[PDB]
Amino acid sequence: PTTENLYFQGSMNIFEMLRIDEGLRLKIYKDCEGYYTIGIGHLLTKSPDLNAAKSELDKAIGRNCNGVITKDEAEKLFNQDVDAAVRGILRNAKLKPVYDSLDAVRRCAAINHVFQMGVTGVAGFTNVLRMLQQKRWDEAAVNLAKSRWYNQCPDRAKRVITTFRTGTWDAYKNL
Ligand SMILES: OCCn1cccn1
């Protein structure tokens, strides 16, 4: 690895990771599962009603947005959502021990997974959690690749799975 290559891991963190997996959109759009989303992976509602999405948006941002936000607002909402995912892991009796056992890079993958699926969804992956705690990385990655989360929307999940396998940031290189 070059001097520049060795600096790459210092440029990656949970924010940069999710920013790549979720993208950045300033107008309401439907994600790969058909759910109204905005910003950096902020799911507004699972309701099919765009008015519901707009109502949630205005609530979240605090002004009359009419379905559009600024980059600064996207970033603030993103930081709030990341904090929520971390807090959700740390207070959960099943996820905290697994998270604590992980290295720094896999901890980011854990937060990313919770950001995407929510706490109960992730806490339901009983086998994967045991595999991770036992450092069975290849088995964990194969099992994640069986999930509906990954299979219904592979591009948003693939990088996370690779990161659980390797504990490096390589899947986020060379976009
Ligand atoms: O995403 C599976 C790993 N994980 C552990 C705690 C939260 N997530």
From Swiss-Prot:
Mutagenesis / variant outcome for changing D31C: Nearly no effet on specific enzymatic activity
UniProt EC number: 3.2.1.17
Annotated consequence of substituting E22Q: Complete loss of activity
Main localization (coarse): host cell
pH dependence: Optimum pH is 7.3.
Gene induction: Expressed late in the viral replication.
Keyword set, alphabetical order: Antimicrobial, Bacteriolytic enzyme, Cytolysis, Glycosidase, Host cell lysis by virus, Host cytoplasm, Hydrolase, Viral release from host cell
Entry GO terms, CC: host cell cytoplasm
Effect the entry attributes to changing T37H: Facilitates transglycosylation more effectively than hydrolysis; covalently bound substrate
InterPro entries (alphabetical): Endolysin_T4_type (IPR034690), Glyco_hydro_24 (IPR002196), Lysozyme-like_dom_sf (IPR023346), Lysozyme_dom_sf (IPR023347), Phage_lysozyme-like (IPR052619), T4-type_lysozyme (IPR001165)
GO biological process: one example: peptidoglycan catabolic process
Residues that, per the record, bind substrate: L43, F115, V128, N143
Family: Belongs to the glycosyl hydrolase 24 family.
The name this protein goes by in its record: Endolysin
Native species: Enterobacteria phage T4
Lineage of origin: Viruses, Duplodnaviria, Heunggongvirae, Uroviricota, Caudoviricetes
Gene this chain is encoded by: E
